[PDB]
Design a protein around this motif. Structure first.
Motif, PDB file in Angstrom:
ATOM      1  N   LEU A  69     -26.106  -3.080  -1.240  1.00 54.89           N
ATOM      2  CA  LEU A  69     -24.900  -2.355  -0.719  1.00 54.89           C
ATOM      3  C   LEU A  69     -24.862  -3.171   0.748  1.00 54.89           C
ATOM      4  N   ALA A  70     -25.570  -3.174   1.538  1.00 53.10           N
ATOM      5  CA  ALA A  70     -25.771  -4.020   2.818  1.00 53.10           C
ATOM      6  C   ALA A  70     -25.091  -5.205   2.648  1.00 53.10           C
ATOM      7  N   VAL A  82     -17.467  -4.841   1.538  1.00 54.48           N
ATOM      8  CA  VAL A  82     -17.372  -3.624   1.947  1.00 54.48           C
ATOM      9  C   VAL A  82     -16.410  -3.338   2.988  1.00 54.48           C
ATOM     10  N   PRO A  83     -16.812  -4.038   3.931  1.00 56.65           N
ATOM     11  CA  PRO A  83     -15.925  -3.900   5.326  1.00 56.65           C
ATOM     12  C   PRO A  83     -14.338  -4.081   4.967  1.00 56.65           C
ATOM     13  N   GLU A  85     -20.705   5.723   5.800  1.00 58.99           N
ATOM     14  CA  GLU A  85     -21.785   6.373   6.229  1.00 58.99           C
ATOM     15  C   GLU A  85     -23.175   5.644   5.396  1.00 58.99           C
ATOM     16  N   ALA A  86     -23.105   5.877   3.972  1.00 62.51           N
ATOM     17  CA  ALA A  86     -23.975   5.161   3.307  1.00 62.51           C
ATOM     18  C   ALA A  86     -24.227   3.239   3.471  1.00 62.51           C
ATOM     19  N   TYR A  87     -23.086   2.836   3.665  1.00 55.88           N
ATOM     20  CA  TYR A  87     -22.820   1.350   4.029  1.00 55.88           C
ATOM     21  C   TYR A  87     -23.750   1.070   5.454  1.00 55.88           C
ATOM     22  N   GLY A  88     -23.115   1.940   6.275  1.00 58.39           N
ATOM     23  CA  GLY A  88     -24.222   1.660   7.800  1.00 58.39           C
ATOM     24  C   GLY A  88     -25.592   2.230   7.513  1.00 58.39           C
ATOM     25  N   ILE A 143      -9.029  -4.889  -1.062  1.00 59.71           N
ATOM     26  CA  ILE A 143     -10.202  -4.273  -1.840  1.00 59.71           C
ATOM     27  C   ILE A 143     -10.955  -5.178  -2.558  1.00 59.71           C
ATOM     28  N   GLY A 144     -12.273  -5.369  -2.567  1.00 58.32           N
ATOM     29  CA  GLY A 144     -12.986  -6.298  -3.041  1.00 58.32           C
ATOM     30  C   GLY A 144     -13.179  -6.380  -4.444  1.00 58.32           C
TER      31      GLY A 144
END
Ligand SMILES: [Mg+2]
Lengths: 471, 473
Positions: free
Chosen positions: A236-237, A242-243, A65-68, A112-113
């Motif tokens: 973060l964007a 992340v995905p 939700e934060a990433y979106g 996992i990155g």
């Protein structure tokens, strides 16, 4: 109405989605559906490894939700960033936990990155509760470096308060002022900020310049802080890993939930082969479900449970159909040992009158036309609801057309001619359900080969013996 | 083992009957309605026919009953409550005079309506159309009212002259005046009840205290004398011995009205009682757009066997006949155009709501028929022999049917077992029947076919385009 709904698959989804720790787990669980074979075997291997080695999960949904929000251009008004950063930090710690295992779980964790450039940027900026620290930018530290002594000096200069005659400094409109008494307001020349009617908050002239400086500095503080926070949000964007990390977190949530469903419902891992063989299988949605064992192979393709009606015949159909469907979707199956074939398509004719017989014929008709030698058929109440004479004649022809196909599965009926047909036919064996005469309840237990009860029950209920002589 | 009225959805018929009652009294009779002595039931039938012939209104008995019960308990009834109970009695006597010249079962009931004239003539003297006690109700109250009216008018208190808020007001039913604050002198009288903010003071001046003291003592004397009249009229209602008999008569007339309302709205007709059953165009009253069928049971043909795979309405026929008997025995009209019914000693319902557990459940009900039933009994059996061996169940089922045919019972049986329809041919006192099926629409029609043995199986498969190479290899 697809076979998933007939066999109560979506209830297995909802039980699975109970045990998902994150919304990403629930979405996979609630969309779960049969899979290609060697992907589904990977889920079985993952489920077994999760049982051996449990793991925690971060808050993937709050991260997503934060990433979106960050991707949408919103200044992701942190913390929120700290919660998102802490999820990434736990995700990386989860990854390095699973990597040395050198198994299917470790391969999932490879997606996992590396989020260290985002983590180090955040932790140098804010780490403790999401207050933006002084050293987050060099400009902000300089702005803070004047905020502290200016703010103190206003409070030092407001005694003042201690000359005069209700003895606490207060903020009105984020400017410092003093609660004088209404009669004594001539002692403190200033600017009226507020009154209570129950008095006379006055800002003295000597601190007007300091408050004007303090207000001006706070604007420059907030402008810099939001500039920092927007920069953190766009980090973060712009984090490309992340995905892939979220996909790994969602899958690991599903696998652990699949392990929990196996733990709770007493499920075991199926193995796949060229034939069906189930040992102590049961319906997982029936409490205190009773175990039955049966097999289907190429020599005996169809099992015909010729009863007096049910006491568990339809449940056993729904047992076999669920086990194949849950195996193909990567779940464990409700047996102690299960060897299963891989049908191309599972057909279930499952629902007692003439127009319910018509509904049975439709699903049989699709079964006749389009099922193959690789298919799995589940036929309930065959020939019931119609004329017992032509109904047995129709049902026998349908059965031996399905025997001529080479299809596998189970059929239930109560028509007497069909139980003699199965005994005198290759590729179909009779079965039945044992009935407890003493208690007059079904035992829900399969009897492999013995296909009766009526006068025996009428005895036990003590119907008149004059009635039960002409019989 | 629960009651056969539950199985036939009789309490639904009770609820529909109570929906059409005007009063709680007739609602109470509807919800306790049971099969009756036969003389009682035919009286209810003749009452219901006459209530159809001449509609009539009902009082609200029920406001009458609850006021009357409170008056017995010793409470002082309100003004309008006494008037409402008086209007119930006044309309009850009008209803009596309306129905008596008819000289029929309705007029026989209406004799129990009492003569309430002494109570009414007390009431109409005392209080008005709105429940207010008139001056002339007692000489004391007339004297008190003759002092209230001039004294209340005499309070002026047009003391302006000076000044406020333009309007005389009441505080604790004492007349007072809204002087604006800060003019508390000039208008003295600082005896007050307070008020909010500036508008305030609501002063009684030191002139109108004396004639607020009187006009307050008077209102106390008025209240006692009004309440004594109200209590006396309350007790006269309690002492009225014809009220409980009138309420009994009104409540029955409410029940008879609702049965007439039930028969109009559900298309019910008055049954005739005799030695045998004959139904013409009978239907289940709880089924919307229900399908009519005709059937007859006598001593020559005791049992009608409906043998066929169908759903149809095979069970709903069993409910149709049995509910018709139970409604007839309750004094209700029955769901047919013409209905001759017998009067069974007992009705036995073997209905469920199919396999070994339920087959044993059928036999436990069928045991009661094999033990307790007499030649006068009506038996209703559903799903005979189903849920077990088609061979051994048919032998058991035929044995039971032979026992019931020897017993002389009448009634109706459903099955799908093939030997039984072969059995019904060539055995006395049992006759085959079946349900027609609409092949072209794939629905049951719903109707019953008399006499033709009953499927359709290969016709359905050809209808549904099953492969022809399948069909009878
Ligand atoms: Mg007087």
């Amino acid at each position: 109405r697809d076979v998933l709904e007939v066999l109560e698959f979506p209830r297995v989804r909802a039980l699975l989605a109970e045990r998902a720790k994150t919304p990403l787990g629930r979405e996979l669980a609630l969309a779960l559906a049969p899979l290609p074979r060697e992907e589904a075997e990977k889920r079985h291997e993952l489920t077994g490894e999760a049982l051996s080695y449990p793991y925690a999960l971060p808050e993937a949904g709050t991260l997503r939700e934060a990433y979106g929000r960050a991707l949408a251009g919103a200044r992701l008004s942190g913390p929120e960033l700290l919660k998102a950063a802490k999820a990434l930090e736990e995700a990386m710690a989860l990854k390095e936990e699973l990597l040395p295992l050198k198994n299917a779980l470790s391969q999932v964790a490879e997606g996992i990155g590396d989020h260290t450039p985002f983590l180090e940027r955040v932790r140098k900026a804010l780490d403790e509760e999401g207050a933006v620290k002084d050293e987050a930018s060099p400009r902000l530290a300089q702005i803070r470096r004047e905020l502290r002594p200016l703010r103190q000096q206003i409070l030092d200069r407001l005694y003042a308060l201690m000359d005069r005659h209700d003895r606490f400094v207060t903020l009105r409109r984020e400017r410092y002022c003093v609660p004088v008494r209404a009669g004594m307001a001539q002692k403190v020349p200033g600017i009226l900020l507020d009154e209570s009617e129950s008095t006379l908050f006055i800002e003295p002239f000597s601190v007007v310049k300091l408050n004007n400086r303090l207000q001006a500095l706070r604007l420059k503080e907030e402008e810099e802080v939001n500039r920092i926070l927007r920069d953190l949000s766009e980090r973060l964007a712009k984090d490309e890993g992340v995905p892939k990390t979220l996909e790994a977190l969602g899958l690991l949530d599903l696998v652990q939930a699949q392990a929990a469903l196996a733990r709770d419902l007493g499920l075991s891992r199926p193995a796949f082969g060229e034939r069906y063989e189930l040992y102590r299988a049961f319906h997982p949605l029936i409490p205190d479900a009773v175990r039955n064992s049966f097999a289907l192979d190429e020599k005996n393709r169809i099992l015909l449970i010729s009863g007096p009606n049910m006491g568990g015949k339809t449940a056993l159909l729904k047992t076999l159909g669920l086990a194949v469907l849950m195996a193909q979707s990567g779940l464990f199956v409700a047996a102690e040992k299960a060897l299963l074939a891989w049908p191309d398509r599972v057909y279930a004719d499952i629902g007692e009158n003439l127009s319910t017989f018509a509904g049975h014929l439709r699903r049989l008709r699709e079964m006749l036309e389009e099922a193959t030698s690789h298919s799995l058929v589940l036929i309930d109440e065959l020939g019931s609801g119609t004329d017992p004479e032509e109904g047995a004649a129709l049902s026998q022809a349908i059965l031996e057309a399905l025997l001529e196909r080479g299809v596998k599965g189970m059929v239930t009926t109560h028509l007497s001619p069909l139980k003699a047909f199965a005994q005198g036919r290759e590729g179909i064996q009779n079965a039945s359900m044992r009935f407890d005469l003493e208690a007059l309840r079904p035992t829900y237990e399969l009897v492999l080969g013995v296909p009766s009860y009526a006068l025996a029950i009428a005895r036990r209920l003590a119907l008149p013996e004059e009635v039960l002589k002409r019989a």
